[PDB]
Amino acid sequence: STKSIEYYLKELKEIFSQIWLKPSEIEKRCEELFKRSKEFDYKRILVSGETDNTTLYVIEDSSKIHVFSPNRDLRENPLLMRWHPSWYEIESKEIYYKCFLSCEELYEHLELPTVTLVNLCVIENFPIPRLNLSTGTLSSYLRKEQLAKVELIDMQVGTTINQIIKNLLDSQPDIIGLSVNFGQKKLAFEILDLIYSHIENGDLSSIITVGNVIPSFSPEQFFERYPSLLICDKEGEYTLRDLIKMLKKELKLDEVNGISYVDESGEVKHNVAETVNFKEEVPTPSLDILGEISKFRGALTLETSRGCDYSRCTFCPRDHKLRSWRPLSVEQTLKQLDDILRAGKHFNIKPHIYMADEEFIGELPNGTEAQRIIDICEGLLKREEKIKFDFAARADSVYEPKRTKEWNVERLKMWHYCALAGADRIFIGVESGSNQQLKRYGKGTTSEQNIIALRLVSALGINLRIGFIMFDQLMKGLDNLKENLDFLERTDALMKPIDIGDMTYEELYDKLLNDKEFIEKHKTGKPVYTIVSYMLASMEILMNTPYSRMVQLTERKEEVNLIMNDGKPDMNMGRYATSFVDKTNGNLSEACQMWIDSNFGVMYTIKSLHKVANPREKKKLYSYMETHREISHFLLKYLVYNLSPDKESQIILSDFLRMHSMEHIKINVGDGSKENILNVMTNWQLIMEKLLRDVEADLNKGIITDSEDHRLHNTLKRWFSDMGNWS
Ligand code: B12
Ligand code: SF4
């Protein structure tokens, strides 16, 4: 009945617009819509597809199948196309409904396997969830291709191991997948143990696979305990597509995209992974978990590109994330952002997107990457409500003197468009302020280039954070630390938001690079270390990095053992434990870790109180955090001074101590032993005591308010009693 068809499509379009509902809830509303007339009886229904291609099949029986596609021309349906590549007329108006009569094989295509994907989480360490793209994009890929019914389970929202197993027994999946991230080995093994014990009991029958970086990097530890396990080495989309084909006996195991496995002869095999056509095959992440994420005050995410076109930083392994850059189209980027924002608004989640991209800006062979960003920004600026979004970028995505002035001026224009469209907290992978160390890091940048990048981005009103790895194991002598400290103390890098007014981009660019009076007029006066993400950080050497091979090459070249655990990496953390080739630098790195450990409880408590404090207490608690960061920066300057004094550092340290009334602060000069370094740090810790005595007095005076369990009182009391104790 054509009147009922129109009514059914219109009602389905309204049902399918609720893209946060899980497919079972969508199906419930579809059953209630089709049971609303006794003038139609059916045997079963199936919903597949997603967002703008969601599709309902009403199976009257296997010989009469109705198909409704309210959001897209049915001729583009991939399931129907696999069943019959010429079922439709190439020249007709778009069709949104079709009844298929006596199409026996079509029923088999509609018997979709079930795939359950589980995101693991150690909720103690990560209490605030973010939309999980690892599983969300695998789900949406499979739904859009109409390859499987997908169930999503996310431990971020509190689902326990026993609730996962209960869920699996109820859903009876054909494929179970776990996303296994840093620190999740023990959780993964516990869940896998229970999965296989229930397979053994006849309660489950499933292909089991694990993915993400931890099993990809260390498969042997997984194969040793679970010999039949299949590991997804890189992207999961085509892997899951091919496991579904293998389920149907349409592929052999040695044909499945991008997996590692133990074959019949007990040998580990690897299958080639074809890089996913991300541009157009991976839609909006599935939003099944979003409602629960909003209850935990969680965050929206999106990945608008995959990979890094640079891929040369020596500490950044590329084997899992790959060495080429694959962007979403502009149109698709804007559609997916619209979807996530609309769904977030339904749950009152604030319109703040955390971009997952390793490289948001990218590089294209035709050189149009900046225009792509400007087009995305122009699309965001057409929206009715403003948004904010965060992303990461290299310093040379801002400023690159090896490129023409015209390229850099167009780059500044692009960054301005990012600011206009809502770019908020941007992370720049500076990593070092020492030209030698930058080269050991494979960053390709100079110290001065990093300063200028920060100047340009901050002048646009964007709110920067930088990565900074102060210590690295191959550093010889103290020169690179002195260079780093000098860089971090520069006050000519961070600019206030500059009113562009009637300046051209070229005028703004020229003034920020060359006009010393202009830079002075507009600086915030804050040193670079104020935007460092993690102070006093030391290099953590991951598996499969150029830096690990540089260390292994130094072990041979200088006949010294640097990689502990008998050269073996940690499977759970995907990284080596490595000593420093320069024992003094190793001692300085160790002391800085002990400094961090010694302040962690009190500073964690101050940070926790700050999140929920009134405006006046918020500023007081923030001032403690600023002072702590300052004391932590000049701790290292003080340690280096006591090993290698110079007059310039003597003045700076004396000025700082005088500003804090600690000029008095059994110390050997030039002595790099652990014992002397600890004695020096015990002395500097008296400055931290001075800060915490102000915190203590403010707490006692009622100027700041403690938590209900008296956490600040308790951690302060312990801190004072632990002074000069190190471990
Ligand atoms: C958000 C994020 C975080 C958040 C995580 C929060 C959370 N609740 O998830 C925070 C800030 C805490 C974080 C911390 C760290 N991170 Co981080 N993080 C990211 C980021 C920016 C996005 C992750 C994402 O959404 N990716 C997009 C999804 C689609 O990719 P995916 O997870 O890899 O999933 C795909 C495949 O792995 C596969 N797959 C995944 N799961 C499964 C499951 C199955 C069954 C199958 C078949 C396939 C499969 O299919 C998916 C689709 O193709 C990535 C960069 C990136 N673009 O990946 C870095 C990144 C993953 N992080 C990285 C690192 C190094 C860290 C830290 C170790 C940093 C540090 N030194 O402290 C810590 C680790 C903390 C910890 N203990 O877990 C590195 C990983 C190493 C590498 N490959 O180079 C990355 C790549 C960034 C970088 N280049 O430095 N991180
Ligand atoms: S650190 Fe950043 S720029 Fe360097 S290879 Fe990794 S993702 Fe690319």
mmCIF file with all atom_site columns, C-alpha atoms in Angstrom, residues 193-367:
data_model
loop_
_atom_site.group_PDB
_atom_site.id
_atom_site.type_symbol
_atom_site.label_atom_id
_atom_site.label_alt_id
_atom_site.label_comp_id
_atom_site.label_asym_id
_atom_site.label_entity_id
_atom_site.label_seq_id
_atom_site.pdbx_PDB_ins_code
_atom_site.Cartn_x
_atom_site.Cartn_y
_atom_site.Cartn_z
_atom_site.occupancy
_atom_site.B_iso_or_equiv
_atom_site.pdbx_formal_charge
_atom_site.auth_seq_id
_atom_site.auth_comp_id
_atom_site.auth_asym_id
_atom_site.auth_atom_id
_atom_site.pdbx_PDB_model_num
ATOM 1   C CA . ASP A 1 193 ? 40.664 -16.965 30.587 1.00 0.00 ? 193 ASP A CA 1
ATOM 2   C CA . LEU A 1 194 ? 36.911 -16.760 31.306 1.00 0.00 ? 194 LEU A CA 1
ATOM 3   C CA . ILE A 1 195 ? 35.972 -16.629 27.612 1.00 0.00 ? 195 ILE A CA 1
ATOM 4   C CA . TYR A 1 196 ? 37.931 -19.788 26.823 1.00 0.00 ? 196 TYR A CA 1
ATOM 5   C CA . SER A 1 197 ? 36.719 -21.606 29.942 1.00 0.00 ? 197 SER A CA 1
ATOM 6   C CA . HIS A 1 198 ? 33.148 -20.957 28.760 1.00 0.00 ? 198 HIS A CA 1
ATOM 7   C CA . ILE A 1 199 ? 33.956 -22.044 25.203 1.00 0.00 ? 199 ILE A CA 1
ATOM 8   C CA . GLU A 1 200 ? 35.359 -25.218 26.766 1.00 0.00 ? 200 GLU A CA 1
ATOM 9   C CA . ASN A 1 201 ? 32.112 -25.624 28.727 1.00 0.00 ? 201 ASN A CA 1
ATOM 10  C CA . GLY A 1 202 ? 29.939 -25.259 25.622 1.00 0.00 ? 202 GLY A CA 1
ATOM 11  C CA . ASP A 1 203 ? 28.445 -21.933 26.772 1.00 0.00 ? 203 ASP A CA 1
ATOM 12  C CA . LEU A 1 204 ? 30.060 -19.894 23.945 1.00 0.00 ? 204 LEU A CA 1
ATOM 13  C CA . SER A 1 205 ? 31.323 -20.668 20.457 1.00 0.00 ? 205 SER A CA 1
ATOM 14  C CA . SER A 1 206 ? 33.244 -17.801 18.887 1.00 0.00 ? 206 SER A CA 1
ATOM 15  C CA . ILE A 1 207 ? 36.251 -16.748 16.918 1.00 0.00 ? 207 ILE A CA 1
ATOM 16  C CA . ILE A 1 208 ? 38.322 -14.802 19.468 1.00 0.00 ? 208 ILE A CA 1
ATOM 17  C CA . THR A 1 209 ? 40.483 -11.864 18.407 1.00 0.00 ? 209 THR A CA 1
ATOM 18  C CA . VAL A 1 210 ? 42.362 -9.086  20.205 1.00 0.00 ? 210 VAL A CA 1
ATOM 19  C CA . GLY A 1 211 ? 43.549 -5.807  18.726 1.00 0.00 ? 211 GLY A CA 1
ATOM 20  C CA . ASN A 1 212 ? 45.184 -2.450  19.483 1.00 0.00 ? 212 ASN A CA 1
ATOM 21  C CA . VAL A 1 213 ? 48.839 -1.841  20.169 1.00 0.00 ? 213 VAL A CA 1
ATOM 22  C CA . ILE A 1 214 ? 49.663 -4.149  23.117 1.00 0.00 ? 214 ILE A CA 1
ATOM 23  C CA . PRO A 1 215 ? 49.017 -7.555  21.415 1.00 0.00 ? 215 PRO A CA 1
ATOM 24  C CA . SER A 1 216 ? 50.225 -6.170  18.071 1.00 0.00 ? 216 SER A CA 1
ATOM 25  C CA . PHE A 1 217 ? 53.622 -5.389  19.572 1.00 0.00 ? 217 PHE A CA 1
ATOM 26  C CA . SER A 1 218 ? 53.927 -8.488  21.796 1.00 0.00 ? 218 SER A CA 1
ATOM 27  C CA . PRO A 1 219 ? 51.966 -11.365 20.224 1.00 0.00 ? 219 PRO A CA 1
ATOM 28  C CA . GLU A 1 220 ? 54.130 -14.213 21.572 1.00 0.00 ? 220 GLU A CA 1
ATOM 29  C CA . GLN A 1 221 ? 52.968 -13.681 25.161 1.00 0.00 ? 221 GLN A CA 1
ATOM 30  C CA . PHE A 1 222 ? 49.366 -13.992 23.971 1.00 0.00 ? 222 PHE A CA 1
ATOM 31  C CA . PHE A 1 223 ? 49.989 -17.023 21.744 1.00 0.00 ? 223 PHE A CA 1
ATOM 32  C CA . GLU A 1 224 ? 51.818 -18.814 24.564 1.00 0.00 ? 224 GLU A CA 1
ATOM 33  C CA . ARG A 1 225 ? 48.693 -18.817 26.739 1.00 0.00 ? 225 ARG A CA 1
ATOM 34  C CA . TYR A 1 226 ? 46.015 -18.803 23.983 1.00 0.00 ? 226 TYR A CA 1
ATOM 35  C CA . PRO A 1 227 ? 47.363 -20.711 20.963 1.00 0.00 ? 227 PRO A CA 1
ATOM 36  C CA . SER A 1 228 ? 44.183 -20.347 18.850 1.00 0.00 ? 228 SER A CA 1
ATOM 37  C CA . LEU A 1 229 ? 43.898 -16.562 19.387 1.00 0.00 ? 229 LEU A CA 1
ATOM 38  C CA . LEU A 1 230 ? 43.950 -14.264 16.349 1.00 0.00 ? 230 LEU A CA 1
ATOM 39  C CA . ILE A 1 231 ? 45.747 -10.931 16.785 1.00 0.00 ? 231 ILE A CA 1
ATOM 40  C CA . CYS A 1 232 ? 44.799 -7.900  14.689 1.00 0.00 ? 232 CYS A CA 1
ATOM 41  C CA . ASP A 1 233 ? 48.154 -6.281  13.900 1.00 0.00 ? 233 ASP A CA 1
ATOM 42  C CA . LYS A 1 234 ? 46.999 -2.882  12.615 1.00 0.00 ? 234 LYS A CA 1
ATOM 43  C CA . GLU A 1 235 ? 43.598 -1.492  11.605 1.00 0.00 ? 235 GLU A CA 1
ATOM 44  C CA . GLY A 1 236 ? 40.645 -3.692  12.520 1.00 0.00 ? 236 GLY A CA 1
ATOM 45  C CA . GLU A 1 237 ? 38.027 -2.915  9.856  1.00 0.00 ? 237 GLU A CA 1
ATOM 46  C CA . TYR A 1 238 ? 39.136 -5.237  7.063  1.00 0.00 ? 238 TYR A CA 1
ATOM 47  C CA . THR A 1 239 ? 40.317 -7.807  9.603  1.00 0.00 ? 239 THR A CA 1
ATOM 48  C CA . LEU A 1 240 ? 36.778 -8.088  10.981 1.00 0.00 ? 240 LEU A CA 1
ATOM 49  C CA . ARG A 1 241 ? 35.321 -8.084  7.460  1.00 0.00 ? 241 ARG A CA 1
ATOM 50  C CA . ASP A 1 242 ? 37.544 -11.049 6.623  1.00 0.00 ? 242 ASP A CA 1
ATOM 51  C CA . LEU A 1 243 ? 36.873 -12.947 9.864  1.00 0.00 ? 243 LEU A CA 1
ATOM 52  C CA . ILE A 1 244 ? 33.190 -12.725 8.918  1.00 0.00 ? 244 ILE A CA 1
ATOM 53  C CA . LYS A 1 245 ? 34.016 -14.163 5.504  1.00 0.00 ? 245 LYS A CA 1
ATOM 54  C CA . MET A 1 246 ? 36.030 -16.911 7.213  1.00 0.00 ? 246 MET A CA 1
ATOM 55  C CA . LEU A 1 247 ? 32.990 -17.651 9.403  1.00 0.00 ? 247 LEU A CA 1
ATOM 56  C CA . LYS A 1 248 ? 31.074 -18.303 6.168  1.00 0.00 ? 248 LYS A CA 1
ATOM 57  C CA . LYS A 1 249 ? 33.915 -20.496 4.830  1.00 0.00 ? 249 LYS A CA 1
ATOM 58  C CA . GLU A 1 250 ? 34.513 -17.922 2.069  1.00 0.00 ? 250 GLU A CA 1
ATOM 59  C CA . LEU A 1 251 ? 38.125 -17.248 3.139  1.00 0.00 ? 251 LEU A CA 1
ATOM 60  C CA . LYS A 1 252 ? 40.864 -19.352 4.641  1.00 0.00 ? 252 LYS A CA 1
ATOM 61  C CA . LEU A 1 253 ? 42.706 -18.202 7.753  1.00 0.00 ? 253 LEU A CA 1
ATOM 62  C CA . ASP A 1 254 ? 45.830 -17.440 5.722  1.00 0.00 ? 254 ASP A CA 1
ATOM 63  C CA . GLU A 1 255 ? 43.761 -15.011 3.589  1.00 0.00 ? 255 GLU A CA 1
ATOM 64  C CA . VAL A 1 256 ? 42.385 -12.922 6.489  1.00 0.00 ? 256 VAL A CA 1
ATOM 65  C CA . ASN A 1 257 ? 43.578 -9.301  6.332  1.00 0.00 ? 257 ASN A CA 1
ATOM 66  C CA . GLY A 1 258 ? 46.081 -8.066  8.863  1.00 0.00 ? 258 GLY A CA 1
ATOM 67  C CA . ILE A 1 259 ? 46.244 -10.818 11.484 1.00 0.00 ? 259 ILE A CA 1
ATOM 68  C CA . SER A 1 260 ? 49.001 -12.760 13.198 1.00 0.00 ? 260 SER A CA 1
ATOM 69  C CA . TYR A 1 261 ? 48.309 -16.322 14.314 1.00 0.00 ? 261 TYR A CA 1
ATOM 70  C CA . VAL A 1 262 ? 49.861 -19.701 15.075 1.00 0.00 ? 262 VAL A CA 1
ATOM 71  C CA . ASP A 1 263 ? 49.491 -21.998 12.071 1.00 0.00 ? 263 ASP A CA 1
ATOM 72  C CA . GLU A 1 264 ? 49.250 -25.800 12.042 1.00 0.00 ? 264 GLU A CA 1
ATOM 73  C CA . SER A 1 265 ? 53.031 -26.301 12.388 1.00 0.00 ? 265 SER A CA 1
ATOM 74  C CA . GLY A 1 266 ? 53.255 -24.131 15.521 1.00 0.00 ? 266 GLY A CA 1
ATOM 75  C CA . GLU A 1 267 ? 54.813 -21.213 13.609 1.00 0.00 ? 267 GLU A CA 1
ATOM 76  C CA . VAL A 1 268 ? 53.699 -17.592 13.955 1.00 0.00 ? 268 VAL A CA 1
ATOM 77  C CA . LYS A 1 269 ? 52.369 -16.296 10.625 1.00 0.00 ? 269 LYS A CA 1
ATOM 78  C CA . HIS A 1 270 ? 51.519 -12.713 9.644  1.00 0.00 ? 270 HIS A CA 1
ATOM 79  C CA . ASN A 1 271 ? 49.010 -11.802 6.950  1.00 0.00 ? 271 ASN A CA 1
ATOM 80  C CA . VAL A 1 272 ? 49.417 -8.593  4.961  1.00 0.00 ? 272 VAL A CA 1
ATOM 81  C CA . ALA A 1 273 ? 47.201 -5.703  6.108  1.00 0.00 ? 273 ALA A CA 1
ATOM 82  C CA . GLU A 1 274 ? 45.750 -3.573  3.329  1.00 0.00 ? 274 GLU A CA 1
ATOM 83  C CA . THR A 1 275 ? 45.518 -0.025  4.660  1.00 0.00 ? 275 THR A CA 1
ATOM 84  C CA . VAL A 1 276 ? 41.876 0.948   5.139  1.00 0.00 ? 276 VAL A CA 1
ATOM 85  C CA . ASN A 1 277 ? 40.247 3.342   2.669  1.00 0.00 ? 277 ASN A CA 1
ATOM 86  C CA . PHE A 1 278 ? 39.503 5.683   5.585  1.00 0.00 ? 278 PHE A CA 1
ATOM 87  C CA . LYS A 1 279 ? 38.446 8.584   3.307  1.00 0.00 ? 279 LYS A CA 1
ATOM 88  C CA . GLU A 1 280 ? 35.046 7.085   2.613  1.00 0.00 ? 280 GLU A CA 1
ATOM 89  C CA . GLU A 1 281 ? 34.579 3.662   4.221  1.00 0.00 ? 281 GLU A CA 1
ATOM 90  C CA . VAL A 1 282 ? 34.703 4.503   7.943  1.00 0.00 ? 282 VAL A CA 1
ATOM 91  C CA . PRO A 1 283 ? 31.586 6.451   9.030  1.00 0.00 ? 283 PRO A CA 1
ATOM 92  C CA . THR A 1 284 ? 30.617 8.222   12.268 1.00 0.00 ? 284 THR A CA 1
ATOM 93  C CA . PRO A 1 285 ? 31.709 6.087   15.262 1.00 0.00 ? 285 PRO A CA 1
ATOM 94  C CA . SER A 1 286 ? 28.879 4.082   16.765 1.00 0.00 ? 286 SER A CA 1
ATOM 95  C CA . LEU A 1 287 ? 27.206 5.958   19.624 1.00 0.00 ? 287 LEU A CA 1
ATOM 96  C CA . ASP A 1 288 ? 25.721 3.023   21.612 1.00 0.00 ? 288 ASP A CA 1
ATOM 97  C CA . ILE A 1 289 ? 27.775 3.914   24.720 1.00 0.00 ? 289 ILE A CA 1
ATOM 98  C CA . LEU A 1 290 ? 27.273 7.679   24.547 1.00 0.00 ? 290 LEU A CA 1
ATOM 99  C CA . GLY A 1 291 ? 24.358 7.812   27.018 1.00 0.00 ? 291 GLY A CA 1
ATOM 100 C CA . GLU A 1 292 ? 26.419 6.051   29.670 1.00 0.00 ? 292 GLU A CA 1
ATOM 101 C CA . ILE A 1 293 ? 29.466 8.186   28.823 1.00 0.00 ? 293 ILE A CA 1
ATOM 102 C CA . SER A 1 294 ? 27.365 11.288  29.517 1.00 0.00 ? 294 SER A CA 1
ATOM 103 C CA . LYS A 1 295 ? 26.334 9.909   32.917 1.00 0.00 ? 295 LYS A CA 1
ATOM 104 C CA . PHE A 1 296 ? 30.049 9.715   33.791 1.00 0.00 ? 296 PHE A CA 1
ATOM 105 C CA . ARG A 1 297 ? 30.604 13.288  32.525 1.00 0.00 ? 297 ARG A CA 1
ATOM 106 C CA . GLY A 1 298 ? 32.677 11.944  29.622 1.00 0.00 ? 298 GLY A CA 1
ATOM 107 C CA . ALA A 1 299 ? 33.954 13.461  26.391 1.00 0.00 ? 299 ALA A CA 1
ATOM 108 C CA . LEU A 1 300 ? 33.207 13.471  22.662 1.00 0.00 ? 300 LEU A CA 1
ATOM 109 C CA . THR A 1 301 ? 35.993 12.345  20.311 1.00 0.00 ? 301 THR A CA 1
ATOM 110 C CA . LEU A 1 302 ? 36.541 11.976  16.570 1.00 0.00 ? 302 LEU A CA 1
ATOM 111 C CA . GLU A 1 303 ? 39.470 10.918  14.384 1.00 0.00 ? 303 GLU A CA 1
ATOM 112 C CA . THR A 1 304 ? 39.512 12.963  11.167 1.00 0.00 ? 304 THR A CA 1
ATOM 113 C CA . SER A 1 305 ? 42.683 11.346  9.749  1.00 0.00 ? 305 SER A CA 1
ATOM 114 C CA . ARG A 1 306 ? 44.898 8.334   10.403 1.00 0.00 ? 306 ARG A CA 1
ATOM 115 C CA . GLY A 1 307 ? 48.682 8.075   10.435 1.00 0.00 ? 307 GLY A CA 1
ATOM 116 C CA . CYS A 1 308 ? 51.545 10.544  10.338 1.00 0.00 ? 308 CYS A CA 1
ATOM 117 C CA . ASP A 1 309 ? 53.134 11.615  7.065  1.00 0.00 ? 309 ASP A CA 1
ATOM 118 C CA . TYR A 1 310 ? 56.348 12.546  8.919  1.00 0.00 ? 310 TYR A CA 1
ATOM 119 C CA . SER A 1 311 ? 56.771 9.343   10.974 1.00 0.00 ? 311 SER A CA 1
ATOM 120 C CA . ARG A 1 312 ? 60.468 10.033  11.699 1.00 0.00 ? 312 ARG A CA 1
ATOM 121 C CA . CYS A 1 313 ? 60.530 10.898  15.407 1.00 0.00 ? 313 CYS A CA 1
ATOM 122 C CA . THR A 1 314 ? 62.852 8.334   16.916 1.00 0.00 ? 314 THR A CA 1
ATOM 123 C CA . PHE A 1 315 ? 60.762 7.712   20.058 1.00 0.00 ? 315 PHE A CA 1
ATOM 124 C CA . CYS A 1 316 ? 57.466 7.227   18.167 1.00 0.00 ? 316 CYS A CA 1
ATOM 125 C CA . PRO A 1 317 ? 56.959 3.669   16.809 1.00 0.00 ? 317 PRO A CA 1
ATOM 126 C CA . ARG A 1 318 ? 55.129 3.649   13.478 1.00 0.00 ? 318 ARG A CA 1
ATOM 127 C CA . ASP A 1 319 ? 54.384 -0.079  13.032 1.00 0.00 ? 319 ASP A CA 1
ATOM 128 C CA . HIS A 1 320 ? 50.840 0.074   14.435 1.00 0.00 ? 320 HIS A CA 1
ATOM 129 C CA . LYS A 1 321 ? 49.736 3.578   13.339 1.00 0.00 ? 321 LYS A CA 1
ATOM 130 C CA . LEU A 1 322 ? 51.513 3.402   9.919  1.00 0.00 ? 322 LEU A CA 1
ATOM 131 C CA . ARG A 1 323 ? 53.685 5.801   7.918  1.00 0.00 ? 323 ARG A CA 1
ATOM 132 C CA . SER A 1 324 ? 51.211 7.477   5.547  1.00 0.00 ? 324 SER A CA 1
ATOM 133 C CA . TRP A 1 325 ? 48.464 10.008  6.252  1.00 0.00 ? 325 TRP A CA 1
ATOM 134 C CA . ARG A 1 326 ? 44.851 9.105   5.349  1.00 0.00 ? 326 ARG A CA 1
ATOM 135 C CA . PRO A 1 327 ? 42.369 11.996  5.785  1.00 0.00 ? 327 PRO A CA 1
ATOM 136 C CA . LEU A 1 328 ? 38.626 11.991  5.996  1.00 0.00 ? 328 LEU A CA 1
ATOM 137 C CA . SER A 1 329 ? 37.045 14.090  3.270  1.00 0.00 ? 329 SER A CA 1
ATOM 138 C CA . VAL A 1 330 ? 35.882 17.575  4.229  1.00 0.00 ? 330 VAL A CA 1
ATOM 139 C CA . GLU A 1 331 ? 32.256 16.629  3.613  1.00 0.00 ? 331 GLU A CA 1
ATOM 140 C CA . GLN A 1 332 ? 32.553 13.519  5.763  1.00 0.00 ? 332 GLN A CA 1
ATOM 141 C CA . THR A 1 333 ? 34.467 15.319  8.540  1.00 0.00 ? 333 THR A CA 1
ATOM 142 C CA . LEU A 1 334 ? 31.633 17.863  8.739  1.00 0.00 ? 334 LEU A CA 1
ATOM 143 C CA . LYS A 1 335 ? 28.939 15.169  8.677  1.00 0.00 ? 335 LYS A CA 1
ATOM 144 C CA . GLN A 1 336 ? 30.585 13.127  11.427 1.00 0.00 ? 336 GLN A CA 1
ATOM 145 C CA . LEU A 1 337 ? 31.135 16.238  13.555 1.00 0.00 ? 337 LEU A CA 1
ATOM 146 C CA . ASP A 1 338 ? 27.467 17.150  13.086 1.00 0.00 ? 338 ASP A CA 1
ATOM 147 C CA . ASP A 1 339 ? 26.386 13.634  14.131 1.00 0.00 ? 339 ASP A CA 1
ATOM 148 C CA . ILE A 1 340 ? 28.505 13.542  17.274 1.00 0.00 ? 340 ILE A CA 1
ATOM 149 C CA . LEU A 1 341 ? 27.544 17.086  18.286 1.00 0.00 ? 341 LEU A CA 1
ATOM 150 C CA . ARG A 1 342 ? 23.839 16.425  17.770 1.00 0.00 ? 342 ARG A CA 1
ATOM 151 C CA . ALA A 1 343 ? 24.019 13.218  19.795 1.00 0.00 ? 343 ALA A CA 1
ATOM 152 C CA . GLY A 1 344 ? 26.071 14.924  22.506 1.00 0.00 ? 344 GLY A CA 1
ATOM 153 C CA . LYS A 1 345 ? 23.513 17.730  22.766 1.00 0.00 ? 345 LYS A CA 1
ATOM 154 C CA . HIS A 1 346 ? 20.763 15.145  23.279 1.00 0.00 ? 346 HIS A CA 1
ATOM 155 C CA . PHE A 1 347 ? 22.623 14.035  26.413 1.00 0.00 ? 347 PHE A CA 1
ATOM 156 C CA . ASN A 1 348 ? 23.643 17.585  27.476 1.00 0.00 ? 348 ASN A CA 1
ATOM 157 C CA . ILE A 1 349 ? 27.328 16.824  26.792 1.00 0.00 ? 349 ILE A CA 1
ATOM 158 C CA . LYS A 1 350 ? 29.154 20.106  26.177 1.00 0.00 ? 350 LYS A CA 1
ATOM 159 C CA . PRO A 1 351 ? 30.124 20.774  22.501 1.00 0.00 ? 351 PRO A CA 1
ATOM 160 C CA . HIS A 1 352 ? 33.846 20.102  22.966 1.00 0.00 ? 352 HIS A CA 1
ATOM 161 C CA . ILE A 1 353 ? 35.516 17.658  20.560 1.00 0.00 ? 353 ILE A CA 1
ATOM 162 C CA . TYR A 1 354 ? 38.826 16.004  21.407 1.00 0.00 ? 354 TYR A CA 1
ATOM 163 C CA . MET A 1 355 ? 40.337 15.153  18.027 1.00 0.00 ? 355 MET A CA 1
ATOM 164 C CA . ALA A 1 356 ? 42.098 11.802  18.162 1.00 0.00 ? 356 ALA A CA 1
ATOM 165 C CA . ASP A 1 357 ? 44.338 12.539  15.120 1.00 0.00 ? 357 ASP A CA 1
ATOM 166 C CA . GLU A 1 358 ? 48.060 12.007  15.474 1.00 0.00 ? 358 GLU A CA 1
ATOM 167 C CA . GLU A 1 359 ? 48.352 14.677  12.752 1.00 0.00 ? 359 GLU A CA 1
ATOM 168 C CA . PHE A 1 360 ? 45.288 16.877  12.302 1.00 0.00 ? 360 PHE A CA 1
ATOM 169 C CA . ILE A 1 361 ? 46.780 19.117  9.592  1.00 0.00 ? 361 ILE A CA 1
ATOM 170 C CA . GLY A 1 362 ? 48.680 16.576  7.525  1.00 0.00 ? 362 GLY A CA 1
ATOM 171 C CA . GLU A 1 363 ? 50.459 16.743  4.177  1.00 0.00 ? 363 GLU A CA 1
ATOM 172 C CA . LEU A 1 364 ? 49.147 15.901  0.720  1.00 0.00 ? 364 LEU A CA 1
ATOM 173 C CA . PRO A 1 365 ? 51.173 15.280  -2.468 1.00 0.00 ? 365 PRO A CA 1
ATOM 174 C CA . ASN A 1 366 ? 49.215 18.139  -4.102 1.00 0.00 ? 366 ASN A CA 1
ATOM 175 C CA . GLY A 1 367 ? 49.975 20.469  -1.170 1.00 0.00 ? 367 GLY A CA 1
#
